[PDB]
Amino acid sequence: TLQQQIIKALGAKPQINAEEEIRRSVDFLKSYLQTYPFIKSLVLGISGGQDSTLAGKLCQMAINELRLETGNESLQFIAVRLPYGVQADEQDCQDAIAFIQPDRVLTVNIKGAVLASEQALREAGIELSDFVRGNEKARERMKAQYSIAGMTSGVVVGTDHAAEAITGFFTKYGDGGTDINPLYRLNKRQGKQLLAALACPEHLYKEVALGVTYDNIDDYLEGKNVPQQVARTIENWYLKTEHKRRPPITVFDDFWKK
């Protein structure tokens, strides 16, 4: 079925072992850094939400272990706060940082650049809708992270996972523009499972457009029987957003023809 095909493509499982998955992601990061020794830092945007808090903890753990094993003191995990003006979630971000205990935290306010980009477009004749402005913000955050990685010999870590990939609920070349994604394969509730296992403060991890809830998505990803109308909605989103999960389309591609 289409559901079996999607589960296979995203690598999702009905049940996972929290500690085992924590080690799979950490060993993955450690292995990559040992294979490309010119990489000295992992860069990740921290929003105070579930996904970036989980990815951040895993990144710091990977760096911590690598430092102790190789003795290389130049390795570092860089957490990047990217508020748009004054974020109404700062306290949560502060708690997220206290939980992660990152080596370094850089704060870059993207409001100035976003307003500048909008002024240039406005003068040319293009006014943005709130939705498009949202994607613009996501792309500015990508830019900041890549500039930081470029100056610190690092790579950009993404928070993409099965529950987001299945619906393509990310900005193309925005938060979807990353180098390595250690959470890919996990669904939403499973991400909470890993955070619980890491003793993450409960308040740190506990809509329309996707006429389905995250529980509907997680159940689908776990291979459960869901209402047919729900399955159709999820599958519609999946089919509609294949372009976001593949490189730019060329004359050789045919997936869009079926």
Binding-site entries for deamido-NAD(+): 32, 135, 139, 172, 179, 243-244
Among 12, 78, 149, 186, binds ligand AMP (CB under 6 A): 149
* Cα diameter, the chain: 56
CA 139 to chain centre: 13
Among the listed ranges 3-11, 48-56, 82-90, 113-121, the one in contact with Mg ion (CB under 5 A) is 48-56
Under the criterion CB under 6 A, does residue 46 sit at the interface with ligand AMP? Answer: yes
Q: Which does 87 bind (CB under 5 to 8 A by kind): ligand AMP, Mg ion, none?
A: ligand AMP
Least distance between ligand AMP and beta carbon 133 (Å): 13
218 forms part of the interface with Mg ion (CB under 5 A): no
Q: Which residues contact 215 (CB under 8 A, 6 or more apart)?
A: 189
Strand partners, 237: none
Q: Which of 175, 218, 219, 222 binds ligand AMP (CB under 6 A)?
A: 175
Beta strands per DSSP E along the chain: 41-45, 76-81, 104-107, 154-156
**Are the CB atoms for 130 and 209 separated by under 8 Å?**
no
Answer whether 44's CB lies under 8 Å from 52's CB. yes
Which partner, ligand AMP, Mg ion, none, binds residue 201 by CB below 5 to 8 Å per kind?
Answer: none
Kindly indicate which of the ranges 15-23, 79-87, 183-191, 244-252 contains the residues binding ligand AMP, using the contact rule CB under 6 A.
Answer: 79-87
With contacts defined by CB under 6 A, name the span among 3-11, 95-103, 152-160, 250-258 that binds ligand AMP.
152-160
* Window 79-118: residues binding Mg ion (CB under 5 A): none
Measure Cα distances from 231 to 167, 220, 238 in Å.
12, 7, 11
When binding is defined by CB under 6 A, the residue of 25, 41, 52, 216 that contacts ligand AMP is: 52
Among 65, 95, 179, 235, the residue binding ligand AMP under the rule CB under 6 A is 179
Minimum distance of ligand AMP from residue 148's CB (angstroms) = 9
Residue 1 contacts residue 180 (beta carbons within 8 Å): no
CA distance 158 to 175: 7
Beta bridge partners of 180: 157
Among 10, 22, 51, 137, binds Mg ion (CB under 5 A): 51
Rg (alpha carbons) of the chain, rounded to whole number: 19
Task: Enter the DSSP assignment of 178.
Answer: -
**Dist. CA 131–CA 118, nearest whole Å:** 13
CB 125 within 8 A of CB 100: no
How many residues form the binding site for ligand AMP (CB under 6 A)? 20
Catalytic positions, written as ranges:
51, 164
- Residues near ligand AMP (CB under 6 A) are 36, 45-47, 49, 51-52, 81-83, 87, 141, 146, 149-150, 155-156, 159, 175, 179
